[PDB]
Structure formats: structure tokens, C-alpha cells
Design a protein around this ligand. Structure first.
Ligand SMILES: [Zn+2]
Lengths: 64, 73
């Protein structure tokens, strides 16, 4: 199920970038709504999500 | 060591590799499907193709080398 986990991580990162925390203020550079983050396209976000996976960047939301 | 309080929380390790050996980067097919699965993302997209090209280049370094005209002069 390792393959599925990898997909889930990428999916979470993609949605986080295209969604974010919804809050205007965010301390996460790689998170939507974050002043330091700029809106990206579906393709652009996909690339960022893939890159984030490689670095295993932490998500804005807390872990389960 | 439970017997010794000092030992506990000290010099204690819990390695958990094994499955960690599996590398996603070693499965481009799976990665491609992931990108395609994402909404608004298609394999026909230039951005997707460009990303794979760059990643592939970094993953593997070309060993090609000129056999002549080494000195441009
Ligand atoms: Zn956030």
C-alpha cells in the first residue's frame, strides 16, 4: 500500500496549494492563502505538489 | 532499559526501514498516473512533460561525450 500512500501525499500537497488553510494568515510558505504563496494553475500546482513530495514538506494542517 | 530509568529515554533507537527500501521515483508509471489523476492535470500538458524531462535528467546524468572537435577554438 506504499504506492497508495505516495499518491495520497501528493494529492494532499496539491489540494493544500490549491486550497490552503483558508485563513488569511499562514506560517506555511507552501500553503494557499499564505501571503508568501501565489495562486498557481492546475499544471503549475501539480509540479509544486510533486516537488513538495520529494522534500516531504510539512502540511499546514496537523498530522492525524 | 526498563530496569534502569537512566537507560530509558536514553541511547534508545527504533529503526524501521525494510519497506522504506521501496522508491517511488523508481516507478515513473505510478507517478505519471498520479499526475493524471489530479484534476486539471493531463499528460498532454507541456508543464507535465517538462517536469518529467527535468526530473529524469537530474535522476540520470548523460554520459555522452564528444569524440572529436574537443577544442572549439
Ligand atoms: Zn496554511
Amino acid at each position: 500500500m506504499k504506492r497508495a500512500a505516495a499518491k495520497h501525499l501528493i494529492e494532499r500537497y496539491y489540494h493544500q496549494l490549491t486550497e490552503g488553510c483558508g485563513n488569511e494568515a499562514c506560517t506555511n510558505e507552501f500553503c494557499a492563502s499564505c501571503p508568501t504563496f501565489l495562486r498557481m494553475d492546475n499544471n503549475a500546482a501539480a509540479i509544486k505538489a510533486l516537488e513538495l513530495y520529494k522534500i516531504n514538506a510539512k502540511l499546514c494542517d496537523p498530522h492525524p | 532499559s526498563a530496569d534502569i530509568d537512566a537507560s530509558s529515554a536514553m541511547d534508545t533507537s527504533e529503526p524501521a526501514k525494510e519497506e522504506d527500501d521501496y522508491d517511488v521515483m523508481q516507478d515513473p508509471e505510478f507517478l505519471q498516473s498520479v499526475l493524471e489523476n489530479l484534476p486539471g492535470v493531463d499528460p498532454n500538458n507541456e508543464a507535465i512533460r517538462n517536469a518529467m524531462g527535468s526530473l529524469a535528467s537530474q535522476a540520470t546524468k548523460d554520459g555522452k561525450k564528444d569524440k572529436k572537435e574537443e577544442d572549439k577554438k
